[PDB]
Amino acid sequence: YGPHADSPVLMVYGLDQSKMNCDRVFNVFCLYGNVEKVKFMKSKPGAAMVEMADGYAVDRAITHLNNNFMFGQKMNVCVSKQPAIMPGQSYGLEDGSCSYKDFSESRNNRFSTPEQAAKNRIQHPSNVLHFFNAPLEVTEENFFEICDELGVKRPTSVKVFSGKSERSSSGLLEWDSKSDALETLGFLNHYQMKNPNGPYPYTLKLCFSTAQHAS
RNA sequence: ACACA
RNA sequence: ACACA
């Protein structure tokens, strides 16, 4: 139905600031479709390359975030000319252990299953944000002290509810700008939850909201 | 802005 | 403890 990119690979630039990393960049556009792998490059003062399902994931990433503002800087996006990303040697990152990472086996892929694709929803970016896999008492109190500990600006509005699951909470958030919700997406997605007596943490997840409000 | 793959 | 109030 929809159009597709000219390559299974994608290119991004403007990653000069220390706030960018392969985990943060790749999950931001991962909410837009199925992904494969990501790779950083030393050949520029701040750039990287990505491999994804090119139809829906590289089209929508180029439709919604490519050269949008983030962290007080820009994250340029456009199509690659490479045939595919190759693993091998690396040099590490300022916020990562390797210049390379893999997601082809990750559950983070939102379109990887028919039980997700039947209820999935996608829209243009906004200052509104949605979350799932969050504590029952996560509200403005846990959202405020978590963002302030990471040095990130806290949201301007918060909402939390139930009935979506009995295992974990869900709700909406909002910021004073679209780039403010996007930079907080980079720092809070896949973040580990705390537990009062649990044997291990479980990760929180978030993405651009389609809700009608955040309060 | 297209790799110590 | 994987996706829209």
From Swiss-Prot:
Keywords: Acetylation, Cytoplasm, Isopeptide bond, Methylation, Nucleus, Phosphoprotein, Repeat, Ribonucleoprotein, RNA-binding, Ubl conjugation. Its main location: nucleus. One of its GO terms (cellular component) is chromatin. Transmembrane segments: none annotated. Residues 8-82, 90-178 form the RRM domain. Several isoelectric forms of the L protein are probably the results of post-translational modifications. There is a cross-link at residue 194 (Glycyl lysine isopeptide (Lys-Gly) (interchain with G-Cter in SUMO2)). RRM domain 2 has moderate RNA-binding affinity. RRM domains 3 and 4 may facilitate RNA looping when binding to two appropriately separated binding sites within the same target pre-mRNA. Splicing factor binding to exonic or intronic sites and acting as either an activator or repressor of exon inclusion. Exhibits a binding preference for CA-rich elements. Component of the heterogeneous nuclear ribonucleoprotein (hnRNP) complexes and associated with most nascent transcripts. Associates, together with APEX1, to the negative calcium responsive element (nCaRE) B2 of the APEX2 promoter. This is Heterogeneous nuclear ribonucleoprotein L. The chain holds residues 409 to 623 of 623 of the full protein.
